[PDB]
Every structure is written in C-alpha cells, then in structure tokens.
Amino acid sequence: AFSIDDVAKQAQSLAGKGYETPKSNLPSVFRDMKYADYQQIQFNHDKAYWNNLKTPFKLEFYHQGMYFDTPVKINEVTATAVKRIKYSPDYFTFGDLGFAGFKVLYPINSKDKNDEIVSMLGASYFRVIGAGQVYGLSARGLAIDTALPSGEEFPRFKEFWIERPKPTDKRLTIYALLDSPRATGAYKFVVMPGRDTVVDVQSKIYLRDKVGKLGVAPLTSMFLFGPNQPSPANNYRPELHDSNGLSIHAGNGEWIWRPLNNPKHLAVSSFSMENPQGFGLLQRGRDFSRFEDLDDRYDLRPSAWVTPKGEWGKGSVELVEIPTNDETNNNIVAYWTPDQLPEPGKEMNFKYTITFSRDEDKLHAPDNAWVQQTRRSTGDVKQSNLIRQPDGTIAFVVDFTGAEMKKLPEDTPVTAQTSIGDNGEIVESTVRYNPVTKGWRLVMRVKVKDAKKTTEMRAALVNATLSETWSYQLPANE
Amino acid sequence: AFSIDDVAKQAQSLAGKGYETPKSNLPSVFRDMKYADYQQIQFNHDKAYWNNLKTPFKLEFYHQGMYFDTPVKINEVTATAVKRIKYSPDYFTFGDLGFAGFKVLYPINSKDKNDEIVSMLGASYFRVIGAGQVYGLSARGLAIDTALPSGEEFPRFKEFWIERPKPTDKRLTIYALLDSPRATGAYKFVVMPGRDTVVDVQSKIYLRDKVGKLGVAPLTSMFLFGPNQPSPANNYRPELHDSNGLSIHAGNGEWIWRPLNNPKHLAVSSFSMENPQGFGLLQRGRDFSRFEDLDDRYDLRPSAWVTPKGEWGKGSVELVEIPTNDETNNNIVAYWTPDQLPEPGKEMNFKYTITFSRDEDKLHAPDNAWVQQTRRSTGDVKQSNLIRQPDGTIAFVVDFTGAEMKKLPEDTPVTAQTSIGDNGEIVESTVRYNPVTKGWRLVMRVKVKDAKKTTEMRAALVNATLSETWSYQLPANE
Ligand SMILES: OC[C@H]1O[C@@H](O[C@H]2[C@H](O[C@H]3[C@H](O[C@H]4[C@H](O[C@H]5[C@H](O[C@H]6[C@H](O[C@H]7[C@H](O[C@H]8[C@H](O[C@H]9[C@H](O[C@H]%10[C@H](O[C@H]%11[C@H](O[C@H]%12[C@H](O[C@H]%13[C@H](O[C@H]%14[C@H](O[C@H]%15[C@H](O[C@@H]%16[C@@H](O)[C@H](O)[C@@H](CO)O[C@H]%16O)O[C@H](CO)[C@@H](O)[C@@H]%15O)O[C@H](CO)[C@@H](O)[C@@H]%14O)O[C@H](CO)[C@@H](O)[C@@H]%13O)O[C@H](CO)[C@@H](O)[C@@H]%12O)O[C@H](CO)[C@@H](O)[C@@H]%11O)O[C@H](CO)[C@@H](O)[C@@H]%10O)O[C@H](CO)[C@@H](O)[C@@H]9O)O[C@H](CO)[C@@H](O)[C@@H]8O)O[C@H](CO)[C@@H](O)[C@@H]7O)O[C@H](CO)[C@@H](O)[C@@H]6O)O[C@H](CO)[C@@H](O)[C@@H]5O)O[C@H](CO)[C@@H](O)[C@@H]4O)O[C@H](CO)[C@@H](O)[C@@H]3O)O[C@H](CO)[C@@H](O)[C@@H]2O)[C@H](O)[C@@H](O)[C@@H]1O
Ligand SMILES: OC[C@H]1O[C@@H](O[C@H]2[C@H](O[C@H]3[C@H](O[C@H]4[C@H](O[C@H]5[C@H](O[C@H]6[C@H](O[C@H]7[C@H](O[C@H]8[C@H](O[C@H]9[C@H](O[C@H]%10[C@H](O[C@H]%11[C@H](O[C@H]%12[C@H](O[C@H]%13[C@H](O[C@H]%14[C@H](O[C@H]%15[C@H](O[C@@H]%16[C@@H](O)[C@H](O)[C@@H](CO)O[C@H]%16O)O[C@H](CO)[C@@H](O)[C@@H]%15O)O[C@H](CO)[C@@H](O)[C@@H]%14O)O[C@H](CO)[C@@H](O)[C@@H]%13O)O[C@H](CO)[C@@H](O)[C@@H]%12O)O[C@H](CO)[C@@H](O)[C@@H]%11O)O[C@H](CO)[C@@H](O)[C@@H]%10O)O[C@H](CO)[C@@H](O)[C@@H]9O)O[C@H](CO)[C@@H](O)[C@@H]8O)O[C@H](CO)[C@@H](O)[C@@H]7O)O[C@H](CO)[C@@H](O)[C@@H]6O)O[C@H](CO)[C@@H](O)[C@@H]5O)O[C@H](CO)[C@@H](O)[C@@H]4O)O[C@H](CO)[C@@H](O)[C@@H]3O)O[C@H](CO)[C@@H](O)[C@@H]2O)[C@H](O)[C@@H](O)[C@@H]1O
C-alpha cells in the first residue's frame, strides 16, 4: 500500500522547486538549554505510541531544545491509513511546536524493560544500538560538502512515516523524507534489533543543484585519544573514543585498516576504488581496562559496518578527521563519495545495510588477520647493559589477531611487507609471536624527516597475505 | 649433625676480629663485562650438582664477572660430611677464581624441565620464584645504613652450605655466613618450591661495631612508571615495575598500602610500630594489558611477603624510593629497622618466612578490601555541556577489590574516611560501585598548595572498616 514511492514522489517534487528554509519558532528558554538542561524534559512513558498494542516496540518523541530547533512531522502508517501524529506538550514533563525527532524502544536487553534501540534526532542523523551496547557513533542519511572550505551542507529528515507493527513482527519499518538546499531524498529503513542491530536502507536521492561532494551512507564518530596518540594530559582513562579505526573491504578484496587520529589540522583521506565491498567505523578492543569510564562505557559502544547492495561504481571511501580538544565534538566522519554525480533532477538509488555490533571479529573475514591495537612508543635500542637508549625514531607496536591467526602454530614463519612515504624512513620492521594473544606483533620504528609534514605508512603480515593492511598516517605536527 | 650453630660459631668468631676486606683477583676481561657479555658464560648442565642422584633438585654455579668479582665458598652437607665444592673452569663454556654464587633448579613448571627457583648472587641478595613466575624483586640477608648520606654498607654471603636432599625431599636446606665491615651473621634457609615458593629463614646476627641503621628481612625491587605516575615519554608499556606497592599488616592489625613512586628525590618513609604482623613488596594487577612487555613479563613477576615469627618489638617498616631514569636500577627497598640495637657482640635472633607469589588476594585478609590500582588524572568538573573542565586539582582513582568485597550487594552504603597533610586540600572524595570489578572506586581530588613540598594522604572504605588504608604520598616536584 504505502511504500518508498510515496515518499520518492514528495522528494522528486521538492527537487523541482526552490528550497524552503525551515524557520525556528522555538522559545529562548529551550534554544538556550545545554545538554544538562535539556534533561529536565522527559517523555511521559504512559503516552508512548503502541502502548495499547501487543508489540514489543514502542515510539517516544523528543521535545525541541538546544540546536534541535525545527520540527519534524511524524506519521503512523497502518494497513488502512497514514495518520499524522499530532504534537502536544502533554507528551512531556518539564520540571504547536512539533516533535524534534523520535526514538524506538524494544526489550533488547531484558524481557520486561523497554530499552532504546534507535534515535532519530538532528539533521539526518540517527543512532542505533544492539544488545548490551550503549549509544556511540551515529549514521546520517546523507552528507554534502563535508570538509570543503566552502562549508558543509547538512540535510535534515523533515518527515517520517513509521509502520505500525503486527504483534509478532521482529522488525520495524521507517520511511523518511530528506530535504537540503541542494538535494532531497526518500529513505526506507528496516530495523532488526538483536545481539547486533541491523538496519536495511534503501535510498532515492535527487540533487536540486550541483554539489562539490556527496557522501553516501555516512558514519560519524569521535576519537579523542588512544594508545597510538595518548592523552597529552594525565587521564585515568587510557583511551577515549566512540571508534578507533576505519575498516575498508576494498573493491579488489584487500582489507584496509586506518587507525584514527585526533589531528592538529583537518585531515581528509580518500581510499579510491570501484565497487566497494564494505566499510565501517570500528571500536576494536573492549576490555574495560582500556577505558575505565563508568559513566559513558566507551567499551560498550558499537562498531558500525556499512554493506552496499550492488555496485556503487567509482569513488572513494573517505575519512575526515577533525582537531578537537574534547569528546563532545564529532571529529570523525566516513562515507562513500561518488567520483561522478548525475545532473540535478536525476534519481540516484543507493541500497545498503548498517550493522551495529560489538563483535568486530564477525565484521571481518575469518581468514584475514586484523589489528587489535596500535601502541605508539619512543623508539629505542637496548644496550649491552639492558638500558633502552632512545635513537630518535618513533615506534608502532601493531598487534594482529584473527579467528584463523589464533589457530596457527607458534613457529609459523610470519613476516611483514611494509612501505613509507618520502617524509619517513623505516629503521626496524620486526614480527614476533605473541603467546598471550595467540597472535603476531609487528614493531615498526620510523624516522620522520620533517615533523611539519604528514607521513604515511602501510604494513601487512604475509607467509609467502595473512592480515589486512595497517594503513597508518602520522599527522604533521605530531 | 650440621646446623645453624656450626655457622653461628664462625659468625660469632668473625665479629670478634677485625674485618677482612675481600680482594678481587678477577681478570679485566670478566670485570669489564656488561650484562650481554656476561651471557657468553654458560654453565655446563652435564656438570650440575646432584646429576647422579634421584632428586628433582639440581645446583649450578655462577662464574665471576661484571661487579660479581669476589668468590664465595660453597659446601655440600651430607649425613656424614661437609665437603667444599671445588672450583673449576670446566663448569662453564665461554664462547682458581672461585664461584660468584649459585642457583637451584627444580621441575616447578614442567615435569621434565629443570627450571630455576633460587639465585644467590651479589652481596647478600637472592631471587626466588614459584610456578609460572619470572624473576623479579630480590631479597637480602641484611641491610646496613640504607639511604643514609654517610653511605650504605652492603654485607655479603661469603660462604654457603647446601644439604644434599633425600630422593623424596620437597624442600632444600641452605646455610649462609654473612660478613660485613660492622656485622656478621648465620642464616638457615628452607626453600619449598610450589605455586608459591616459600622460604623459611632463621638468622643470628652480630654487630662488630655500632651502625646507624639495621634493616632486617630486606626486599629490593624497582618501579619505573605506572598509572599513578605515567611514563613521561610515550611507551607501548602502560606500566614498568617489579613491584607497585608496599603492603603492611601493622602491629595493631591495620592494613596499610603504600603505592610506589619513582620520585625526583630520595624518599624514605617509616611506618613506626611494635610487633609487625607482616610486610611485602607486591605486584598487584597481572593482566598482560598493563605491561605489554613480551621480553621481561613484568606481569609474571612475584610479590614477596615477609611474615615474622615472634615479636620483633619496636621499630618501623621502612620504604626507600630512589630516583631512576631506567629499570636497571633497583630503586625500591623495604625492611624492618629496629629502633634499638644491642651492643656489638650480642646476638640478635630473627625468624621469618618470605612467600613469593602471584596470588595477591592470598597475601591479604579475606575480610579486608585492597587497592587493585591507583590511576592519577587531571582533576575536572563536567560542565552542563558535557565538557570536562580542569579546575587545577589532581585526581586519584583508587579501585578496591577483595574476596569479601566482590560479594557485597551493589547497594551497600560504602563511604571513604580520608585525610591530607597541610600542603594539600581534599576537594572531592567520592565512592561509587564498580559493576565491572564488583568492587568500589574512590575518586579523590586534591589541590596541592606548594608543588615544591611533599603531600601525604590516607583513605579507607568504611560501612559504619571494609578496606586497607591507601597511604599515598605525592612527591615534591611532581
Ligand atoms: O524503567 C526502568 C527504570 O529505568 C531507570 O533508568 C534506567 C535506564 O532506563 C531508561 C532508558 O535509558 C536508556 C539510556 O538512556 C540514558 C540516556 O541516553 C540518552 C543519550 O544520551 C547520551 C548523550 O547523547 C547526546 C549526544 O552526545 C553524543 C555527541 O554526538 C552527538 C552529536 O552532538 C554533537 C553535535 O553534533 C551536531 C553536528 O555536528 C557536526 C559538525 O557540524 C558542526 C560544525 O562542525 C565543524 C567544525 O567546527 C567545530 C565546531 O563545531 C566547534 O563548536 C568548534 C569549537 O570547538 O570547533 C570547530 O572545530 O569544523 C570542522 C573543520 O573546520 C568542520 O568539518 C565541521 O563541520 O560546526 C558548526 C559550528 O560552527 C556546528 O553548528 C555544526 O553543527 O560537522 C562535523 C563534520 O561533518 C560532524 O561530524 C558533526 O556531527 O551537526 C549537526 C547538524 O547541525 C547536528 O544535528 C548535530 O547535533 O555538535 C556539537 C558541536 O557542533 C557537539 O557539541 C555535540 O556534542 O549530535 C548528533 C545529532 O543529534 C548525534 O548523532 C551524536 O551522537 O558527542 C559525542 C561524540 O563527539 C558522543 O560520544 C556523545 O554521546 O549529544 C546530543 C546533542 O547534545 C544529545 O542529543 C544526546 O543526548 O551522550 C552522553 C555522553 O556520551 C551520554 O552520557 C548520554 O547517555 O542520548 C540519546 C540520544 O542521542 C537519548 O535518546 C538517550 O535517552 O542518557 C542519560 C544521561 O543523560 C541516562 O541517564 C539514561 O540512562 O540509554 C541506553 C543506551 O545507551 C539505553 O539502553 C537505555 O534504554 O531510557 C528509556 C527511554 O528514555 C526509559 O524508559 C528508561 O527508564 O536504563 C539504564 C540502562 O539500562 C539504567 O542504567 C537506568 O537505571 C529509571 O531511572 C527508573 O526510574 C526506571 O524505573
Ligand atoms: O633445556 C630446555 C631448553 O631451554 C631453552 O631455554 C629456555 C629456558 O631454559 C633454561 C632456564 O631458563 C630460565 C630463565 O633464564 C633466563 C635468564 O634468566 C636469568 C636472569 O636474567 C634476567 C636479568 O637478571 C639480571 C639482573 O637484572 C635485574 C636487576 O636487578 C638486580 C640487581 O642488579 C642491579 C645492581 O644491583 C646491585 C646493588 O645495587 C643496590 C644499590 O647499590 C648501588 C648504589 O646505589 C645507590 C644509588 O646510586 C645510583 C647508582 O647505582 C647508579 O649507577 C647511578 C647512575 O644512574 O644513579 C645513582 O642514583 O643512590 C641511591 C641514592 O643516592 C642509594 O640509596 C643507592 O644505594 O650505587 C653504587 C654506585 O655508586 C653501586 O655500586 C651500588 O651497588 O643500592 C640500592 C639501595 O639500597 C639497592 O636497592 C640496589 O639493589 O648493589 C649490590 C651491592 O653492590 C649488588 O650486589 C647488586 O648487583 O645495581 C646496578 C647499578 O648499581 C644495576 O645496574 C643492576 O641492574 O642485582 C641484584 C644482585 O645480583 C639482583 O638481586 C637484582 O635482581 O635490575 C632490575 C631491577 O632494577 C630487575 O628487574 C632485573 O631483572 O641483573 C643482575 C646484574 O646485572 C644479573 O646478574 C641478572 O642476570 O634481568 C633481565 C631484565 O629484567 C631479564 O631479562 C633476565 O631474564 O638472571 C638470573 C639471576 O638473577 C639468572 O639466574 C637467570 O638464568 O635470562 C636469559 C636472558 O638473559 C633468558 O634467555 C633465560 O631464559 O629464567 C626463568 C625465570 O625468569 C626460569 O624459569 C628458566 O628456568 O635456565 C636453566 C638454567 O640456566 C637452563 O637449564 C634452561 O635451558 O627456559 C625459558 C623459560 O621457560 C624458555 O623460554 C627457554 O626456551 C634453551 O635455549 C634450550 O637450548 C634448551 O633445550
């Protein structure tokens, strides 16, 4: 009955007309709120949608506040009707504005507890979690001109339709209409809560005008510090980040792992390929000892893996790393950016799944080893007297692990194929067996010729390829 | 037949005569050796003592080299004889000097592998390990004038007698004669290899002249950096130390835990008491993730716990912390120093056990919680906008755990009784439940008034005492 086509015709139609700028009529008392103040507004769980039905799903809504200062329209779809969900203040306690966004609840952790699984709130952003997870990185519907000096353009999901589920349904269907100065689109999301929460996405996109850069299936995260770039000041937390790497499964079948930085200057990195097999911002390594944060539980925050359905043609998986002095800034972005876009008006179809998981092993081929961690260190040489003498190099300790690598005999003759750009020199490239992890450790020591330039390096473990490619960048002014 | 009395009469007799300075006739080629060079000398395992007997014990010997440049005499005791073990170069390959010291082998880890359990080498030092352990901290027979500006005096074990074991014996008996400018002594060690290796010690000590300070049952270790005092430079190792705290079981029954520092200036700390119940340099926290060192395995290095037999009267358990830029210096010392020593010639009896273990829980009363770790951090206040704003305080995150604490209901109302010296002010003293550890976490934030003075603080968890006392010192110029 109702389908993506219904929403695509609105999108098609919006693309053919001048963009209408949303206008805020939000009172100052709400717009001026900071996060802590925004908490004063809570939803009345007695008024949650589907409270009268035998579904484990429920729908709750956000009030406008902070920079969430334009309304979105929300519709329920039934077998027989599309019904606007009417706004009311009586959905909230505060101790015709319109909803800011919505969330979905489901007993994903405990049978008699309705826990959040999806949050759609801000622009075209959503956050998703599976069982035992805590909200971390975000996804968007679309990105336009991300990292361009001209200024990024942020689409919004301005309207939603949410199908009322049947009592036995284990998935939830959501449609969204996207509008942005130079683009519109129609989105069908099928959400499947589980150990992982999986989101099936179909999109239909239309430019209203030409753009510098489109970013398809965007992910947005945060990296403040980690063992590859330790906290400049003492912190009880060894690490702080919603993600620690970009994993790519290339067109050509190579696995690439780019550990994240919090750089001094904006860094955009393009992995140019044809027909990407997948990409994800991953949180690899979940021992609580790596984080020690009892409030935000970064150890419990998901990885997100994007899997295209079909051939996305020629473009790049692009990473954006933004300087931040704190964790409140989303300083990591990843997307697919097509090399060539169509003329305005012409429809682009993108189909993909997003998997939100804490099983990074499952987000990787079992016959291909992967980097558990990248530890930076002062490069040294142990003297005859056992004193470790610094020699001016930087050292990277890169531990590989894997479902198949953890199985290999200790005596397996593993070596490293490495490379470095011109601003750097590899002094040492050693591989040894790690009997604690059943994996293999690479130690790479490098001299930087000019600290004021970027240095890029690559490494993989081979017998005679066993591992993904560690693709590391050492930011200028590090 | 043979007993400690045999050795005590030699000791008694040496104390009544002028001290004879040992003389080195070691060739330059050996004295000039650094550790790596000293390795060139290996013992011929075919010539190990007791190779002709049905004992799991074996005895091997060290060649002189480095600063091990005076001989020690070694004797075997049998039922019928004391026999000098004759020196020979044919005990070694090099690819009448006399032995430098000896080691004991035993199948403590694997049934057909003779692994080291005891090393007696250098002055009056020995190192001991149980099953699955790697050599770490040391013990001595005695310490004299440790940390005194006049200069420490180092006794040596100049002669040893080692009882030949019966085939079924699970212990080994060793006697040693101690000589030092101003003191002599006789030592019986009974070594019991196990999961822990336990050393039963009887000593008889005689001063040849008055001394500034005697140190009974000394332990010697090393602390380079840890989470309470993180590596000033990037290191892949989160921590590096053979020990991370002094545990005291006081005369009065209090448990005290003093986390170690690598200070900028010599720090001596005295815990004055009567009838100490025990003390030990402990390595608390053995996840490999804390160390990451595959060469030296600090995670596998023992704790040593000293248990007096009898009442040692009035004195102090004393800790000495020495500045070091590297791990090769033994910059941690602990001992019992009597308040009052007898006149020279008069015999002092000290009986005690040393337990070398990796079960720190077993080195502590089950009804008393203990500090798993002390993490230093920049003190901050989270703002309304979730940004953590530094306020100029230093924060200590102190996690408690325990066989009984891990059992307590989460809702148990645990609070902290704390205190600080005059150079400091406690701004925050918070206790929360740690659901990952089943323990409780203390966060203490303090302002230092003068960074150029030492600051001391104490804290314990109480219901209405649950924990040992965390006795922390913040070194001047930290
Ligand atoms: O019944 C029974 C019982 O119960 C109980 O209880 C219980 C429970 O239960 C319950 C349940 O619960 C649940 C839970 O809950 C919880 C909660 O939760 C929640 C959550 O919260 C959280 C939070 O979150 C938050 C967030 O955060 C985040 C973030 O991120 C984010 C973001 O934000 C941001 C932003 O963004 C934006 C964007 O941006 C972009 C950009 O752009 C920009 C630009 O930029 C540029 C640059 O520039 C720069 C700037 O910016 C700056 O400013 C400067 C200065 O500095 O700098 C510079 O540089 O530049 C560059 C170069 O040049 C460029 O390129 C760029 O562009 O800028 C501009 C300016 O100029 C601007 O404007 C713009 O914007 O860009 C970039 C690039 O591209 C990118 O990347 C970015 O992105 O933008 C856009 C457009 O516009 C927008 O839209 C956005 O917004 O930004 C800012 C700045 O800008 C910042 O600030 C921020 O931050 O956002 C987004 C969107 O929205 C998102 O997505 C994201 O996420 O951050 C971080 C990262 O970084 C992360 O990490 C975080 O997380 O945030 C937001 C806002 O604010 C909010 O909204 C939220 O909220 O978080 C925290 C922390 O972490 C945590 O803690 C929390 O938690 O949330 C959610 C939502 O999301 C909700 O839903 C939830 O609810 O919480 C609470 C506390 O509070 C608690 O309490 C609770 O619990 O949960 C769980 C899970 O987890 C579950 O499971 C559960 O279930 O619930 C239910 C329902 O309700 C009920 O029923 C129940 O009850 O449970 C539990 C468990 O189990 C238990 O325990 C309990 O017990 C009770 O009590 C009783 O009674 C009962 O009985
Ligand atoms: O058969 C089958 C198969 O097998 C195979 O193989 C296998 C195997 O098997 C086998 C077995 O094996 C085994 C193993 O083995 C191994 C080995 O092992 C070994 C070991 O080694 C190790 C090492 O060790 C070493 C050591 O080290 C250590 C150290 O410590 C020590 C010490 O040292 C030090 C010194 O000390 C001294 C003292 O000092 C004191 C002081 O005083 C001083 C003064 O001071 C002052 C100050 O001042 C300062 C100065 O000093 C400076 O200089 C400056 C400048 O800077 O500064 C300043 O400041 O001041 C202050 C304030 O003012 C004051 O207070 C002070 O006083 O000064 C002066 C000057 O002026 C001076 O003079 C003086 O001295 O004081 C303080 C205070 O009180 C104190 O504390 C201190 O103490 O002093 C004294 C008197 O004089 C002396 O005596 C001493 O010496 O010092 C120096 C400086 O001074 C330094 O440098 C040094 O370092 O020492 C002591 C004594 O001796 C001891 O006790 C200790 O320990 O260090 C650290 C700490 O720190 C530690 O940690 C370490 O450890 O060292 C030594 C010397 O050098 C040597 O001797 C040794 O050796 O270590 C390393 C590292 O860690 C390691 O790595 C190694 O390992 O050793 C042992 C012995 O001990 C032996 O025995 C053994 O053997 O190793 C190798 C490698 O190499 C390997 O390879 C092997 O493996 O083991 C295990 C266990 O672990 C076992 O289990 C096993 O069994 O064996 C058998 C038999 O042989 C056979 O049979 C078999 O075969 O097994 C394995 C496992 O299972 C496997 O894997 C394999 O495979 C094969 O191959 C095949 O073929 C076959 O088939």
Author numbering:
A (entry chain A), B (entry chain A): 22 to 116, 127 to 495, 498 to 511
Paper text:
Most Gram-negative bacteria synthesize osmo-regulated periplasmic glucans (OPG) in the periplasm or extracellular space. In this study, structural and functional analyses of OpgG and OpgD from Escherichia coli revealed that these proteins are β-1,2-glucanases with remarkably different activity from each other, establishing a new glycoside hydrolase family, GH186.
To generate hypotheses regarding the very low reaction velocities of EcOpgG, we determined the complex structure of EcOpgG (D361N mutant) with β-1,2-glucan at 1.81 Å resolution. In the catalytic pocket of the complex, the electron density of a Sop16 molecule was observed. The dynamic conformational change from a loop (residues 409–425) to two β-strands upon substrate binding is a unique feature found in EcOpgG. However, the β-sheet interacts not with the substrate but with the α-helix 3 in the complex. These observations suggest that the closure motion of α-helix 3 is required for forming the β-sheet. A β-1,2-glucan molecule binds to the substrate pocket in the complex of EcOpgG at almost the same position as EcOpgD, except at the subsites –5 to –7 in EcOpgD. However, electron density for nucleophilic water is poor in EcOpgG, which strongly supports the observed low SGL activity of EcOpgG.
